[PDB]
Design a protein around this ligand. Structure first.
Ligand code: MG
Ligand code: MG
Ligand code: MG
Ligand code: MG
Ligand code: MG
Ligand code: MG
Ligand code: MG
Ligand code: MG
Ligand code: MG
Ligand code: MG
Ligand code: MG
Ligand code: MG
Ligand code: MG
Ligand code: MG
Ligand code: MG
Ligand code: MG
Ligand code: MG
Ligand code: MG
Ligand code: MG
Ligand code: MG
Ligand code: MG
Ligand code: MG
Ligand code: MG
Ligand code: MG
Ligand code: MG
Ligand code: MG
Ligand code: MG
Ligand code: MG
Ligand code: MG
Ligand code: MG
Ligand code: MG
Ligand code: MG
Ligand code: MG
Ligand code: MG
Ligand code: MG
Ligand code: MG
Ligand code: MG
Ligand code: MG
Ligand code: MG
Ligand code: MG
Ligand code: MG
Ligand code: MG
Ligand code: MG
Ligand code: MG
Ligand code: MG
Ligand code: MG
Ligand code: MG
Ligand code: MG
Ligand code: MG
Ligand code: MG
Ligand code: MG
Ligand code: MG
Ligand code: MG
Ligand code: MG
Ligand code: MG
Ligand code: MG
Ligand code: MG
Ligand code: MG
Ligand code: MG
Ligand code: MG
Length: 111
RNA sequence: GGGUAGGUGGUAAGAACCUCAGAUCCGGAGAUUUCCGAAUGGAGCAAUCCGGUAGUUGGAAACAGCUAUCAUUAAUUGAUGAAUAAAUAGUCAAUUAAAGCAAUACGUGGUGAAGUGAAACAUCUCAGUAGCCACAGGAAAAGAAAACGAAUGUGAUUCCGUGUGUAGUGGCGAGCGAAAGCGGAACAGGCCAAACUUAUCAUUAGAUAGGGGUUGUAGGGCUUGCAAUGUGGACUUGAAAACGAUAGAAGAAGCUGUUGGAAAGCAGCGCGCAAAAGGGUGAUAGCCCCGUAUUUGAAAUUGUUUUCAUACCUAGCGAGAUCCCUGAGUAGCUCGGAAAACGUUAUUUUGAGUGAAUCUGCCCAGACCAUUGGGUAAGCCUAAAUACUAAUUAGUGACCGAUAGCGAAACAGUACCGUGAGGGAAAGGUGAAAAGAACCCAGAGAUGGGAGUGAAAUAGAUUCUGAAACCAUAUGCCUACAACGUGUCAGAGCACAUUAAUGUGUGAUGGCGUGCGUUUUGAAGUAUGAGCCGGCGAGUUAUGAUAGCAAGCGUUAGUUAACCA
RNA sequence: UUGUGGUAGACGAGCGUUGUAUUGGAGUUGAAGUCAAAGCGUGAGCAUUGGUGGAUCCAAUACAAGUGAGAAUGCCGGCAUGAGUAACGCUUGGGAGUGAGAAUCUCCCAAACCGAUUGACUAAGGUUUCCUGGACCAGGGUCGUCCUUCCAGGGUUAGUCUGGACCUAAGCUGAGGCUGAAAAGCGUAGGCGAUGGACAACAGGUUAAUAUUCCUGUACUUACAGUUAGACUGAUGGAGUG
RNA sequence: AAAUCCAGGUACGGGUGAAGACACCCGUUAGGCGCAACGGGACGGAAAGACCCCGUGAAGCUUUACUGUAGCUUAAUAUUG
């Protein structure tokens, strides 16, 4: 399975942004990146191009979007625990459904 | 089958979809596989053209779709059948194999030079090398003594060390150079012909298909008995098991503060280890991530080994007879060549000619004869150790790091050159992240100057660092009566202030002064080589000999080579 | 105390580069590289500071070398000198327009050369160079708003034309076969091979680009089937013509 | 653009010198820098002299040079009575 999936809450443990909590919107496995909403906001200088029916307007000024972040800098966020903390996960297989599930190693919380 | 939550190959954003009834992706097994090309229906200027035959569907037929088949050679079988009665030649049909390619590499065989050396050259060497051709194989070749060879000897072949640069062979010149023996790697021996016998061929068999046999301290057959039912194979089918190969699963351990754009660096306090190999993460991370040590797992295909059964092959010691068999245009010999270290010679081989004997036999022990001894030619097959790497997996390097390393880090045998064979380049790096510069000004625009992002824009796509030659700008000094290898020793004036040093920059003027390498008796040279700058560019390696120095071991010393771990 | 010029040459002692092995050390508070300066050594050489640069490097003792560049009419790359010099490879003037910019682009009027040709149709070859619009990185021996250059789109219509589905010449290939160490050479029957032979379409119009091809008009030729009438049909071979 | 180019700030007379000097010795002359000319010199440039000699160099050709050989011719022997 994968350490980080599309949807789970995640934070950053290195860089200028420390303790930045967000939801992963998209994962590129090949480039080992991850788009997390609200984090790594870059503002491309949006030019103007008019060669299509939609390009006739293409209103784009200082649109701030999301820049991808290396998957190593991401860490899963705990929610079930009363005191939330950042830890590592296991890949135990519970015989109830025989499906692999991530479980933290500093607690006993699933996913 | 594995495996998930993403995917629709790269320059690549966007549009539109697919995907949790399990996608994309990885592995095993299959399906489809246009045309040229051995190309093989016929042709042809390769990727084109023109068909025949037998089916089937439309048409009223020509015709048009959709299928299968149609080359040549060799072998077997059957049919037909000339000159010419029979019979062959030939013709036709059916079945089975062959064609070709590549691994710039190893094997075998045929053919086979020259440059060069001998300080010339012809014998010789180079060299049975290059090249040309044929046939393979996963290796090939060789192979079980008519042997070595001098002994109370060894007992297929192959490969390594030594014997040794020895015996020898050489216009006895340049050179060439074994075979024994010894030490090792591996080890395996089998099977036909003839006798004798069985059955069948107008049985003129002298032919076909079986039993019997495979030799040297001779063997086998003929007749007559004892003992045997085993051990082992280079061996067929199956069944079972084990070890693997082709995807994978799990896989421990960290926070705080400081400089910093960013920590993983630094410091403090800790933790894990059968994991401190490696890669990435904004700098230099055992504990951030992927992994690694370790434990594991295969539906399907495939490799090795073992066990059981099952085919095939595989078996000893006597007696008598005194009879038969033991590989012929063969061994020898003569005339021309060659192979072996030998430049032809005892041994091996052959183009021409001739030509034997049959265990009281034949060959050999460097001409040859006799004695002694060794071995059984003229038939075949043979694993292992040995040679090599185009390719697949893992990994290593006192190997290279864009003039280096493969010619080719990029889309390189490309661009390009030549009718053709053939020849054959250069060219890598923005930033952590494109956040690739919206917007304003000048301009026609590219572009430039600001703004903005960024730690850095003198990192801006001309994109890591940016040297010299070369071209321009400027502070300071000098220079327009001056004979100059352009410098050196003195020396005013001018302008500054340093790796603080009897300082630095320029140099009115005085004295002296014909470059650097090469090759020459002798070069400023009217001898030669260099336009300048930068990179590259020429005493090495392997095997031996001598001598100097030093160390280890020493007076029945010293030291191993191959090979094994 | 005696000495210390020196080529060929002999001997001895050292420096420097890259990497490896052992020790220690420095580095985003800035390493290598790289530039400058008024330093230290007997020599190869070695430091200090500052600028640029952005991640490795240094000292000691040993070891191994693709280990030292000024010359080879040396190789490669760059840049000078000659020198803004020679040369720019046969053809004039003006008006109007476009354009930011015009001797060079567009149109018009002349002018000058070709006129058995610089005119028109095609074979061979070339392979999109053809037409339209746009552009002025590069190429055009100047310029350029323009080009045979570049970008985007488009363009080649056959029963009768040129060649196959027809035929052969020189010649090539060639089952069998002959010859030859091998590869192969020769060659019969067959099969290819035009630059030749046989074969049915002419006139006009149309698009920016095609036209005996598309359109209009009028024709012709060869096959197959049905049908009507007549006739016995007569080749893979012989002969004539070709 | 081009060949060329050791660096140049590149006079003349007599002498000297590797024997014919822009550069040496002794004298004379000459303000700095161009442009258009013409070729005296720079033993000017282009071509590692083709003439000559040397090399125990190469190649082509010749012959009663040497050694061989294709081919031609003669004999023995086998096919061969
Ligand atoms: Mg599946
Ligand atoms: Mg010779
Ligand atoms: Mg010689
Ligand atoms: Mg010689
Ligand atoms: Mg064999
Ligand atoms: Mg895993
Ligand atoms: Mg882990
Ligand atoms: Mg690390
Ligand atoms: Mg003999
Ligand atoms: Mg020999
Ligand atoms: Mg005997
Ligand atoms: Mg003897
Ligand atoms: Mg015998
Ligand atoms: Mg290269
Ligand atoms: Mg380069
Ligand atoms: Mg070409
Ligand atoms: Mg800028
Ligand atoms: Mg540049
Ligand atoms: Mg740069
Ligand atoms: Mg003056
Ligand atoms: Mg005067
Ligand atoms: Mg004077
Ligand atoms: Mg003077
Ligand atoms: Mg002076
Ligand atoms: Mg002087
Ligand atoms: Mg020198
Ligand atoms: Mg001389
Ligand atoms: Mg002389
Ligand atoms: Mg001179
Ligand atoms: Mg001369
Ligand atoms: Mg010379
Ligand atoms: Mg010169
Ligand atoms: Mg140089
Ligand atoms: Mg010694
Ligand atoms: Mg001396
Ligand atoms: Mg070192
Ligand atoms: Mg520095
Ligand atoms: Mg070198
Ligand atoms: Mg030049
Ligand atoms: Mg110039
Ligand atoms: Mg001039
Ligand atoms: Mg002139
Ligand atoms: Mg002129
Ligand atoms: Mg002209
Ligand atoms: Mg003119
Ligand atoms: Mg006229
Ligand atoms: Mg014309
Ligand atoms: Mg073109
Ligand atoms: Mg046009
Ligand atoms: Mg145009
Ligand atoms: Mg121009
Ligand atoms: Mg028509
Ligand atoms: Mg034809
Ligand atoms: Mg014709
Ligand atoms: Mg036309
Ligand atoms: Mg004199
Ligand atoms: Mg000469
Ligand atoms: Mg000679
Ligand atoms: Mg010679
Ligand atoms: Mg004769």
């Amino acid at each position: 399975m994968q350490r980080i999936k599309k949807g789970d809450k995640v934070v950053v443990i290195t860089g200028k942004n420390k303790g930045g909590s967000g939801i992963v919107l998209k994962i590129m496995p090949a480039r080992q990146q991850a788009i997390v909403e609200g984090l790594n906001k870059v503002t491309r200088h949006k030019k103007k191009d008019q060669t299509t029916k939609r390009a006739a307007k293409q209103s784009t000024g200082k649109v701030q979007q999301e820049a991808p972040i290396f998957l190593s800098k991401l860490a899963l966020f705990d929610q079930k625990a009363k005191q939330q903390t950042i830890g590592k996960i296991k890949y135990v297989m519970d015989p109830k459904t025989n499906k692999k599930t991530r479980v933290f190693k500093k607690s006993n919380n699933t996913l």
